[PDB]
Amino acid sequence: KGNAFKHKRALVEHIIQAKADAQREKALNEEAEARRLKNRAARDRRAQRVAEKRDALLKEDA
């Protein structure tokens, strides 16, 4: 409704580029969320393993 697009071909190419950029963004954001959830799980596990080392691992062999 502005112009932005001399014709159908121009609009199609613009759609292609926009979709490609959006997909790049989506992939980056998704792998980032994956990394962060993975790190959070690991740093809950370490918390478990070290918080339950003071209690009943510090008594038997060593």
Partner: protein, 155 residues
């Protein structure tokens, strides 16, 4: 990037004298030429693995970096395979024993081995003339962002 898919142009884009024989059934189907540009500039995996051609590239193309190496900030990305960098510096005036800020803008060719954005600092090297105004080519990038995308995500 660059969505040439690989062959957007009306001529066939290839590396010259790089011949992939359809007879020999080589188990790569990927014959490329790259070079070490030199001076400890790392040849990117995007260039080695990519499909682009870019004869003006310092890694897969025919130009050679020789002379000066400069640094600057990208203040434009609106051309195709070239940018404009700002090169800021201080000029001394002895009468006043003081300095004054000056800039020169410097157009640069950028390969599609680099994802360059306005604001990024970029190191460039002197090539032969490849346009009216361009004599330099991007050979290294340093993005001054840290991928600070989620800082905009606020809720």
């Amino acid at each position: 990037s660059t969505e040439l898919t690989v062959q957007s142009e009306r001529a066939f884009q290839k590396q010259p004298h790089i011949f992939n024989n359809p007879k020999v059934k080589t188990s790569k189907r990927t014959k490329r030429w790259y070079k070490n540009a030199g001076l400890g500039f790392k040849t990117p995996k995007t260039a080695i693995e990519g499909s682009y051609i870019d004869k003006k590239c310092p890694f897969t193309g025919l130009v050679s970096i020789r002379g000066k190496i400069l640094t600057g900030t990208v203040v434009s990305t609106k051309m195709h395979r070239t940018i404009v960098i700002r090169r800021a510096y201080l000029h001394y005036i002895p009468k006043y024993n003081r300095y004054e800020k000056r800039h020169k803008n410097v157009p640069v060719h950028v390969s599609p081995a680099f994802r360059v954005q306005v604001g990024d600092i970029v190191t460039v090297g002197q090539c032969r003339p490849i346009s009216k105004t361009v004599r330099f080519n991007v050979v290294k990038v340093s993005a001054a962002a840290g991928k600070a995308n989620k800082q905009f995500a606020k809720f």
